[PDB]
Amino acid sequence: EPVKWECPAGYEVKEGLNVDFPHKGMKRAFIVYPAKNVSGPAPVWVPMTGSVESTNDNLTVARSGANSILADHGYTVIAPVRACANQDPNIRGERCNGPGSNGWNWNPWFEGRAADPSGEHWKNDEGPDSSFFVAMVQCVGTKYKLDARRLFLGGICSGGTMTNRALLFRSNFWAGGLPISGEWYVTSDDGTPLSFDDARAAVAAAPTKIHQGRVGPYPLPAKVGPLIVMTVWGGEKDLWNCTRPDGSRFLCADYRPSTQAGSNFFSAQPDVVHVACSSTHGHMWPQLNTQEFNRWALDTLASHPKGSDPRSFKLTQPPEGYTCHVGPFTGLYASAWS
C-alpha cells in the first residue's frame, strides 16, 4: 500500500496551525513544524497528547515532552489536534478527558472500541482518527519533502493507545511508532470485553501470551506490515486514576499489562522490530532526560526505515533513566521457569 501525496481539493497546507481539514465529515486541525538542517525527504514524527495535556502542551512544554523540538533534530513534526478539542490546540481536559461516545471507549482519540455492544462496529473499522492521520501526512507531503519509509507516530496515555491502534490498522503506511503507556484494553480470546480488574488479571495469569484487545481489530491481525515499535512503561507508578462526575478518583488503568500485551504481540511479528523500554517516571511523558530520550527514541525508530530487515537492526544505549531491549517486556511479570 504505497504512500501517495495528495490533499483534499483546494486545501492549502501551511507551516504552523492548519484548521478545517476535511475528513470523514469532520473538520480537523494539526500543526506542522518543518524539519531543520535537512536536505531532501525528512523523517516524520506525529506526536499525540493524552487525556489532559493540550496539543500545545505536548508540543512546547518541557514536562509534557516539548515534541515540536524534534524539528530542530531534523524531523518534520505533524501534530494532530484531538477531535474533542474542536480544533483548539490549547484545550486540555475540557470535553476531552472522559469516556467516549458512539461506540468509542475514551474521548481524547478514537482509540478503542467501547465495552458495550455499541463498540461492535469498531472491531474492524480503524475509526476516524487513524484514517485522518494518514490523510494529514499525505497532504503535508505535497508541500514538504517527507521520507515515505520513515513516517512515525507516537504519544502518551490515550495518545499511546491511539498509537497502538494506528499501528495495528495502518501497518502498511507507518514505518513504526512510540506508544508510551498506552492501553491495549485486553479482552478474552473470543473478543469479550473485560473489566479493568479482569483484564489486569488475564495478563498476570498468562504474561507471555498474545492477548486480544479493544485497542485493535478483532481478532488482531495474523500478520502486520513492516514496522519498528518502541513501547515504553513508566514503572510501578504507571497507573491512571479516572475521575467520577462527583470529582472522586478511582484506579482505572494499569500500564504494566497493556505495555506487556503490546510487546508480546509486536515481538511475535516477523517483520516487526519491537523495543521494550522501561523507566520510573510514572504515567506522563518520560521525565528523566526528556529531550535526550526523545532524540534517542526517534533516531532509533529512524534507524529502521520501512522494509528494513529486522536482523540488521542494532539497538544503541538509551539515556540514563531507561532500560531497553529488543523483544517483549521481561521485567514486569515473573518468568514461568522461576
Swiss-Prot record:
Keywords: Hydrolase, Signal. It catalyses: nonane-4,6-dione + H2O = pentan-2-one + butanoate + H(+). Catalyzes the hydrolysis of 4,6-nonanedione, a beta-diketone compound. Also mediates hydrolysis of oxidized polyvinyl alcohol (PVA) in the second step in the degradation of polyvinyl alcohol. Not active toward the monoketone structure. InterPro entries: AB_hydrolase_fold, Plant_Biomass_Hydrol_Est. Its EC number is 3.7.1.7. Belongs to the peptidase S9A family. Monomer. The active site is at C157, S263. The lineage of its organism: Bacteria, Pseudomonadati, Pseudomonadota, Gammaproteobacteria, Pseudomonadales. This is Oxidized polyvinyl alcohol hydrolase. GO terms for molecular function: beta-diketone hydrolase activity. It comes from the Bacteria. It comes from Pseudomonas sp.
